Amino acid sequence: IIGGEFTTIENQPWFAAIYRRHRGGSVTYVCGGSLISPCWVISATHCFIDYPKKEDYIVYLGRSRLNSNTQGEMKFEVENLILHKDYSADTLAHHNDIALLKIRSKEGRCAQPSRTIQTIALPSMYNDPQFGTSCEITGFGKEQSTDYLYPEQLKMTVVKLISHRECQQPHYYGSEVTTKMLCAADPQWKTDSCQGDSGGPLVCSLQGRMTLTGIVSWGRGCALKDKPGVYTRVSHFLPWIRSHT
Numbered sequence: 001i002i003g004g005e006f007t008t009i010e011n012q013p014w015f016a017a018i019y020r021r022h023r024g025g026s027v028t029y030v031c032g033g034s035l036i037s038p039c040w041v042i043s044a045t046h047c048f049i050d051y052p053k054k055e056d057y058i059v060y061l062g063r064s065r066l067n068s069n070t071q072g073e074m075k076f077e078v079e080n081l082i083l084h085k086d087y088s089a090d091t092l093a094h095h096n097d098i099a100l101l102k103i104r105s106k107e108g109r110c111a112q113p114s115r116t117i118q119t120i121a122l123p124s125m126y127n128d129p130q131f132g133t134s135c136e137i138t139g140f141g142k143e144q145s146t147d148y149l150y151p152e153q154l155k156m157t158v159v160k161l162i163s164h165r166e167c168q169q170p171h172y173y174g175s176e177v178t179t180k181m182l183c184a185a186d187p188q189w190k191t192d193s194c195q196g197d198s199g200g201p202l203v204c205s206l207q208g209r210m211t212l213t214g215i216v217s218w219g220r221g222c223a224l225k226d227k228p229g230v231y232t233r234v235s236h237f238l239p240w241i242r243s244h245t
């Protein structure tokens, strides 16, 4: 997250922190995700496509820091890694960049909701907020495009939804953006998602309910003028989600 503010898991208790085991035992951060039911986390396919083996991954819930434990956190193995069959990557844009992880503990249990662990509602189909609506994004991704490290403390910021028509201008993304994607950005291009925020939540208030409107997917640079963040449009994938859960 470029700009924005530091936060803790209580302000985004559906946030899932996804790591991968190596090859000798080191564990490194991969991507964010969102808890949509006790046993299911939703994220982006591009996070897993190069290492599509479920046994390689670890999911934490209730975690506010990257490389230290948070009191009350839960750790899970991945019982099921479901990547979207129609995924594709061109140079910049990822199509159908959506993935489901079924989580199970060594004790074989799903998530127990607590003060630091809650689910997030999915939207109703084809129902998103209007352009210019302010939404929030959360993650452990870079604080600057040039950074080598990820922040140790969770961050969040606010971005405004951009119209498909605006996003498709050549100056923006041209045809790279489809109707199954959403664009969002700061009016000053001052704050944004970045590398390491992939898979995490774009949350909007719809009908007075916090709703998983988007999943961080891609962008050209971070917080660059005319280059919004691009998000998987969750309201266009509900059958896929429902079928696979």
Ligand SMILES: Cn1cc(-c2nc(C(=O)NC(=N)N)c(N)nc2N2CCCCCC2)cn1
Binding pocket: 145, 192, 193, 194, 195, 196, 197, 198, 216, 217, 218, 219, 220, 221, 222, 223, 224, 227, 228, 229, 230
């Ligand atoms: C040098 N480099 C990378 C990025 C990057 N950016 C984003 C991103 O969300 N960008 C944005 N909202 N403007 C992203 N989801 N993934 C990224 N990457 C790049 C794609 C390949 C690995 C994932 C990290 C930005 N600058």
